[PDB]
Amino acid sequence: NNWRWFDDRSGRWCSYSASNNSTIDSAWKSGETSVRFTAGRRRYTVQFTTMVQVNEETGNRRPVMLTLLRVPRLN
Amino acid sequence: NNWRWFDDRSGRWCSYSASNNSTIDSAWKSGETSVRFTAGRRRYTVQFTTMVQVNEETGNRRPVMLTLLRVPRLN
Amino acid sequence: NNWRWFDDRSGRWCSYSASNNSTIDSAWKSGETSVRFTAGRRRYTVQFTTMVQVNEETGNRRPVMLTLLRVPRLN
Amino acid sequence: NNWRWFDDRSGRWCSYSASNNSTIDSAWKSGETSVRFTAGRRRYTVQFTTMVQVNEETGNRRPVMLTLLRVPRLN
Ligand SMILES: O=C(O)CN1C(=O)c2ccc(C(=O)O)cc2C1=O
Ligand SMILES: O=C(O)CN1C(=O)c2ccc(C(=O)O)cc2C1=O
Ligand SMILES: O=C(O)CN1C(=O)c2ccc(C(=O)O)cc2C1=O
Ligand SMILES: [Cl-]
Ligand SMILES: [Cl-]
Ligand SMILES: [Cl-]
Ligand SMILES: [Cl-]
Ligand SMILES: [Cl-]
């Protein structure tokens, strides 16, 4: 679960479901500029060119981030 | 201009001023867990452990992001 | 796909097979410090703390790298 | 500091001198596709499009890497 979306109501970064994270990450690795996914009766588009998620039912925009692991890894 | 903060009023990622971007990036590269800066006579702290900017007067939290350069570089 | 090992004979970075790349990347995302994989019966270990692949039949150490895609993505 | 070159005699990644690391990192941040630097009587070019250091006299190719900081930062 490496992708996150920001919830401005709670003021915290939130995780995607395992399947939505996998849909987003597969599109990210394939070079697509955007990806759609469904969660709890809403369709969303993650726009990779702006790092913003758009709720396609309401139009609400929430920022997204990709977590990055340290290189090299610590012992 | 590698650091950005999300403005939920405009629905867009926003750039820091050149000096605030430099202040934030120098603290990021030094391994600090947070950094202080001011903009428009207001004080903020960027918390690197949560990737959020905190308005010190209101407590309002806005997300932040670091732009990343491709490795390897494209020709 | 995203992991590469350096071939000193040819002087080039080389891709892994889709299956070996998936094995390495799953272990990378799970926080493991190392991962074993095979190319047929030939055994290898990728040591994430040193970013080196050890050929477990010859003992030869080849460096490894993880490709990093640009954030945000270009249009 | 943050750039490293692979020493296949010892089988390990090695650091650049502080000045060579600064020269490489300044060219990296400026969008250049390559950078030249010296170490005593040795002359090198780091090719960012292939992540390889080339000895200008002999053509010997040593792979390079850029260390990456975790995002978000750990406490
Ligand atoms: O729709 C809203 O108000 C807020 N919201 C999102 O932005 C979002 C993104 C992904 C998932 C998921 O389960 O993967 C759930 C949600 C969710 O509830
Ligand atoms: O939260 C607010 O008060 C709104 N707001 C910010 O969050 C912020 C951060 C950076 C700069 C800058 O000039 O570098 C300006 C602003 C700004 O207008
Ligand atoms: O000459 C060798 O055996 C290998 N070798 C290099 O490729 C190299 C590159 C930069 C520096 C430095 O001091 O910045 C040191 C060396 C070094 O020792
Ligand atoms: Cl939403
Ligand atoms: Cl090598
Ligand atoms: Cl070998
Ligand atoms: Cl000499
Ligand atoms: Cl050399």
Distance B4 CA to ligand 1 centre (A): 22
From the number of C-beta atoms within 10 Å of its C-beta (0-12, 13-18, 19+), residue C27 rates as middle
Beta-carbon pairs below 8 A across chains C and D: 29
What is the sign of the dihedral through the CA atoms of B68, B74, C4 and C6?
A: negative
- CA within 13 Å, CB half, D39: 18
What is the sign of the dihedral through the CA atoms of D32, A69, B46 and B29?
A: negative
Mutate to test the pocket of ligand 1, among A3, A9, A15, A20 (most ligand atoms within 8 A of CB): A20
Q: Within a 10 A sphere around the Cβ of A63, how many other Cβ atoms?
A: 26
Q: Tokens representing A73?
A: 């890894």
Stretch 15-74 of chain B: residues touching chain A, C-beta under 8 Å: 50-52, 60-61, 63, 65, 68
Find where tokens 């005593």 sit: D40
Chain B residue numbers with beta carbons less than 8 Å from the beta carbon of A50 are 12-13
From the number of C-beta atoms within 10 Å of its C-beta (0-12, 13-18, 19+), residue D29 rates as exposed
**Cα–Cα distance measured from residue D5 to residue D27, given in angstroms and rounded to the nearest whole number:** 16
Residue from D74, B51, B32, C26 nearest A64 by CA: B51
Resolution in angstroms comes to 1.9
Q: Are A36 and A24 in contact (CB under 8 A)?
A: no
Q: Tokens representing C41?
A: 């019966």
Q: Report which DSSP code applies to C58.
A: T
* A61: CB partners within 8 A, 6+ apart: A52, A53, A54, A55, B8, B11
Distance C24 CA to ligand 5 centre (A): 20
Q: What angle do CA D69, D26, C63 make, to 5 degrees?
A: 50
**Cα–Cα distance measured from residue B49 to residue D35, given in angstroms and rounded to the nearest whole number:** 33
Q: Within a 10 A sphere around the Cβ of D38, how many other Cβ atoms?
A: 12
| Helix-strand-coil split of chain D, %, nearest 5 | 15, 45, 40
Sheet containing D34-39, strands listed edge to edge, beginning at the edge strand earlier in sequence: D12-15, D3-7, D61-66, D52-55, D42-47, D34-39
* D2 vs C: CB within 8 A: no
Helix (H) or strand (E) holding C39: strand C34-39
